[PDB]
Design a protein around this ligand. Structure first.
Ligand SMILES: Nc1ncnc2c1ncn2[C@@H]1O[C@H](COP(=O)(O)OP(=O)(O)O)[C@@H](O)[C@H]1O
Ligand SMILES: Nc1ncnc2c1ncn2[C@@H]1O[C@H](COP(=O)(O)OP(=O)(O)O)[C@@H](O)[C@H]1O
Ligand SMILES: *C(=O)CCCC[C@@H]1SC[C@@H]2NC(=O)N[C@@H]21
Ligand SMILES: *C(=O)CCCC[C@@H]1SC[C@@H]2NC(=O)N[C@@H]21
Ligand SMILES: [Mg+2]
Ligand SMILES: [Mg+2]
Lengths: 77, 21, 446, 446, 77
């Protein structure tokens, strides 16, 4: 389907807070306007918005794992 | 390149004496 | 030592830094763009981080991206190498503030020496002679400009203060085109370096570009390591360097070296830098200083035996210079040739896959490059693919070694300037030595 | 000067001699067999002559063919390199008969030093220490043999007088197997060197193979260039050679070197040679001498800066020694690794096409080999395909550079012993230095 | 297209003596075995016999020209 990849370099987080609910989860679908993950860079927690609405097939990374530019994160079918 | 080299024949007019003995 | 460092560069210099790090037991982080996933140093590095898309302005010049890559990997230093951000004082200050050692000079020194006008002023203050010129940025007083030009003597050259790479320079023969040349050079500087500051300098017609290598630890110590004669240039870009410069007796060497070391001590220099000059009538005339490791440093390394990049890494860690001036001995002569992926006649880049490749080898021949069989030279970056250094007990031995090594090198699938280098090697005047900085352009007979 | 010379060899030494010739401006004739038409030096030589079919007994050991090639090409000298006919006195005198210059010692010198029974006697006469042993050829007087064995002390080793390459040697621990060991050694000597003479010597169990390199011009001058340490051997075939030998103090170095030079003067030696000693308890024990350039000689070139093959050519041309003893200075430490083409777990040669090849580069890394991508390694000749010499200001830097350069090296399509070299480099005792000749077999343990 | 090749490195001669007649020429054929040419090496003139009965299609190397091992000398049939 469609793969959304990190637009910068930083640590990958799924929960905006240390103890809170994830932005999204595998299964439950998402729309064009929505935040899926957090890519912290220099203590500036950023948000990633997808471009194609669909069912979230899988999340290819885990929280706390650093990512790189053009790094596949989530695949939506 | 030096791999694609074609052997050129020797110059005939080159003499090196060798003793008869 | 440094626990880990980031190599914020690409190509040959990235391999030079990676190898120096490996020899020293330093972990390496190799930041690369999306088009440089097949680079040799990327495939040999301990860690790899992609920092941006193919274009340089988005990947290798993205200071936030490199800082982020250093942060996530837990690096403790960043080595810029040469080009890109090596002479970017903003990069230096930001890196040092973020909490990572910048392997190079201080931000203040980069700012001071980068501005060629301030650099010339400081050199004059410290006792380093300089080429007669405007002695300051050009103003609107055209009467004063022409009076100074007449006093020094035509022709004159207008050079951008923040210029680099041989661009933003125009030679003026008389007062007729001075204003127009200045205006167009300022516009070009605005377009390229986003800085229109320019200055005027006397134009020497038969100089020899001689540059001194200086190592200073920033704690009040500094040494000089022979010189290099980069006279053979085309379009203000070097093609063949050599070291030590022919005809520069040890007396002149010690003279200029002592002056440059004193200048480094006075301005509180740190790291490895190069003091360019112009040589004529037995007198040097400073032109600019390079606050970074130079592309042609291998010749100095090979004649002096001092690994310059390892010295940079040691200085950045804070260790004082362990090499005394009396312990620096020049033994032999090294000649370097730059190998570019470009048309030997149209001098235009020739990106493309390299179908076969067999690098030269033998005694006293160093091949510093990052290409291999199957490498696809991207079009987004500079056209240099490697350097070829040959060392011998004298100039003639080194040049013969260079001829053999160039004959032995194979690069197919692209157009490379190997035949031009062979031609330069076969030039009788070059073999004699002492050629001026304009010899190569005249050799084309155009 | 020599107008033209014939390189009567193949592979890496042929490239070395051809490249030295090119440097000195000497015309080269590269005699090859019918299966060697693809060799790099054959394609880089000025004139090439196919002297015989693939087998060595018909191509490179054919003295008439090499002489005929020299005759038709109008050459004036013949360089045997190493192997084949380098230590062949018949070749020396037969080349000197026909008015050609033999680049090497005299025929009488090769005859004298060519049989160890006479070389040991000459060295004892010259004051060079020798291993206690039979002090003469072994006969059928078994009572005398056992008396000698008791006098010298067990264990004992039976070595063929004309032995070479590590073969024809049997270690005997007691009188039980003495006769059978002697018989089998004689049979192998007959089948290999056409000389059944053997002699018994003391079998030191913890020596270090330390050899001296000496240059002599045959006019009363002789010098010694540091030493080597070939203690990393397998089946008496060297794998890693380094210079200078760790733990050999300058006093001991000079003490052995001056005696070696005096011995060279005694026999009126010419050209480049090598004395092989066993180092134990600070005492050197001569075993044999190599009257030819040695395979591992590049290590001695990278620490003294003296090109040995160019010295051989100059000495053959008649010029006297241009290097004084005081002018030789050891600056650094070089470590070499022979890259063979064999199964690493079975040491059986592995001929076959080389599909990929990428030689390593870097500051102080020398790659001496004739192979290239698409080169079909023939099965008829020995398995060595290249050498890799890494140099540094100290032993640790050389070892680290070697470890880096061994990873950067790619050889696909054939089974090569690069992983063995990598694991030898990482060995801790090797990094400590001073290991004994039997260490590698113990490490492998099989 | 049988090719007879030189068996040694030396100078190729047609006439057994400098002022004598050539051994063979194109056209006129040769039997299974007979002298065909001369290769001289270290003096000691050596005569190259023929192995195939047939017509001399062509001779590729002139007199006095050095030849190497297995150098194509003549083509017969
Ligand atoms: N004042 C001058 N007179 C003559 N040639 C000069 C002068 N200034 C620069 N050049 C030529 O241009 C080359 C590069 O000058 P430089 O100031 O180092 O510019 P860049 O920053 O582009 O390297 C010099 O090596 C020299 O050949
Ligand atoms: N007397 C000895 N004691 C112990 N080892 C020996 C002795 N002689 C030879 N060797 C071992 O064999 C190796 C080769 O010996 P050498 O006489 O040079 O034979 P080759 O002619 O085969 O090279 C030596 O480097 C050493 O390791
Ligand atoms: C600054 O020093 C780094 C602190 C990291 C805090 C963030 S909040 C989201 C992540 N979850 C967690 O437990 N720590 C991370
Ligand atoms: C040996 O001394 C060289 C020349 C020997 C004479 C022979 S006779 C056949 C060849 N033709 C000629 O003119 N000289 C050679
Ligand atoms: Mg410059
Ligand atoms: Mg030996």
């Amino acid at each position: 389907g469609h793969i959304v990849r990190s637009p910068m370099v930083g640590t990958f987080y799924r929960t905006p807070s240390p103890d809170a609910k994830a932005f999204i989860e595998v299964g439950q679908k998402v729309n064009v306007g929505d935040t899926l993950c957090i890519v912290e860079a220099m203590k500036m927690m950023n948000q990633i918005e997808a471009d194609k609405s669909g069912t979230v097939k899988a999340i290819l990374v885990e929280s706390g794992q650093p990512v790189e530019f053009d790094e596949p994160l989530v695949v939506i079918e | 390149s030096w791999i694609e080299r074609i052997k050129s024949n020797i110059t005939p007019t080159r003499k090196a004496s060798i003793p008869e003995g | 030592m440094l626990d880990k460092i980031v190599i914020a560069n690409r190509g040959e210099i990235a391999l030079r830094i990676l190898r120096a790090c490996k020899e020293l037991g330093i972990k390496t982080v190799a930041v690369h763009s999306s088009a440089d996933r097949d680079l040799k140093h990327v495939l040999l590095a301990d860690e790899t981080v992609c920092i941006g898309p193919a274009p340089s302005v988005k990947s290798y010049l993205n200071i936030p991206a490199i800082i982020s890559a250093a942060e996530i990997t837990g690096a403790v230093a960043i080595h810029p190498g040469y080009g890109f951000l090596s002479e970017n004082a903003n990069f230096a200050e930001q890196v040092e503030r973020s909490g990572f050692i910048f392997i190079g000079p201080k931000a203040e020194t980069i700012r001071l020496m980068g501005d060629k006008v301030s650099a010339i002023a400081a050199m004059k203050k410290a006792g380093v002679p300089c080429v007669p010129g405007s002695d300051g940025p050009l103003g609107d007083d055209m009467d004063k400009n022409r009076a100074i030009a007449k006093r020094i003597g035509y022709p004159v050259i207008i050079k951008a203060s923040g210029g680099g790479g041989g661009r933003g320079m125009r030679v003026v023969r008389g007062d007729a085109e001075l204003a127009q040349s200045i205006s167009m050079t300022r516009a070009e500087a605005k377009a390229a370096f986003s800085n229109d500051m320019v200055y005027m300098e006397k134009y020497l017609e038969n100089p020899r570009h001689v540059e001194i290598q200086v190592l200073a630890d920033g704690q009040g110590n500094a040494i000089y390591l022979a010189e290099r004669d980069c006279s053979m240039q085309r379009r203000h870009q070097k093609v063949v360097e050599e070291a030590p410069a022919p005809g520069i007796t040890p007396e002149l060497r010690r003279y200029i070296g002592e002056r440059c070391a004193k200048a480094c001590v006075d301005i509180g220099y740190r790291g490895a830098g190069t003091f360019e000059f112009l040589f004529e009538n037995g007198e040097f005339y400073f032109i600019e200083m390079n606050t970074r490791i130079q592309v042609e440093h291998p010749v100095t390394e090979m004649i002096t035996g001092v690994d310059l990049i390892k010295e940079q890494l040691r200085i950045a860690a804070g260790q004082p210079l362990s090499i005394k001036q009396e312990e620096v001995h020049v033994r032999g002569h090294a000649v370097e040739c730059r190998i570019n992926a470009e048309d030997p006649n149209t001098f235009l880049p020739s990106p493309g896959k390299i179908t076969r490749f067999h690098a030269p080898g033998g005694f006293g021949v160093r091949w510093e490059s990052h290409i291999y069989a199957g490498y696809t030279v991207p079009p987004y970056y500079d056209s240099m693919i490697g350097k070829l250094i040959c060392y011998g007990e004298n100039r003639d031995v080194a040049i013969a070694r260079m001829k053999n090594a160039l004959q032995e090198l194979i690069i197919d699938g692209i157009k490379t300037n190997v035949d031009l280098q062979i031609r330069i090697m076969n030039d009788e005047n070059f073999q004699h030595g002492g050629t001026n900085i304009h010899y190569l352009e005249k050799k084309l007979g155009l």
